[PDB]
């Protein structure tokens, strides 16, 4: 039985200050929402494991941390966190690359890696990383990243 008050009472009781203009605690709760969802998307992602030959659960294109937004952006920081936790719940073959891509396109100023093909760069939107050939070689072998 899902009961998201427990996640709420474990987050909102972190003592932050009411003098900063940005409340980190408020932001995480913001994105996590109570839209009336009765959390059937967890059971549409469990029941889509018996039919992964048919339907593959892709991460939604709107829910990625968008580009033109660094890692300092706190709504675009929690969206990169919530993508990582909800990574392998999706039965998508390229999801792991996408989860990795979301962060690598989030801080593409301090940490440049090498994207394996021409045609896309590091600051390419992470949703486009959907072919097997365009997995970055640093991700296929972490010894290439210095």
């Amino acid at each position: 039985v899902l009961d998201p008050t427990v996640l709420t009472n474990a987050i909102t009781t972190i003592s932050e200050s009411t003098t900063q203009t940005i409340s980190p605690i408020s932001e995480i709760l913001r994105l996590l929402q109570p839209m009336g969802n009765d959390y059937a998307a967890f059971w549409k992602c469990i029941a889509s494991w018996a039919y992964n030959g048919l339907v593959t659960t892709v991460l939604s294109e709107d829910a990625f941390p968008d580009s033109s937004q660094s890692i300092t952006h706190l709504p675009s920081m929690w969206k990169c966190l919530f993508l990582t936790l909800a990574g392998p719940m999706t039965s998508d073959p390229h999801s792991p690359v996408k989860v990795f891509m979301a962060l690598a396109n989030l801080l593409a100023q301090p940490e440049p890696i090498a994207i394996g093909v021409p045609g896309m760069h590091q600051t390419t939107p992470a949703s486009q990383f959907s072919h097997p050939g365009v997995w970055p070689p640093g991700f296929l072998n972490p010894q290439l990243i210095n």
Binding site: S68, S70, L107, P110, T123
Partner: peptide, 13 residues
């Protein structure tokens, strides 16, 4: 520093 370091890491064309 934070206003400046948000001007390096903006992704402008």
């Amino acid at each position: 520093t934070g206003v400046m370091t948000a001007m390096r890491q903006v992704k402008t064309m």
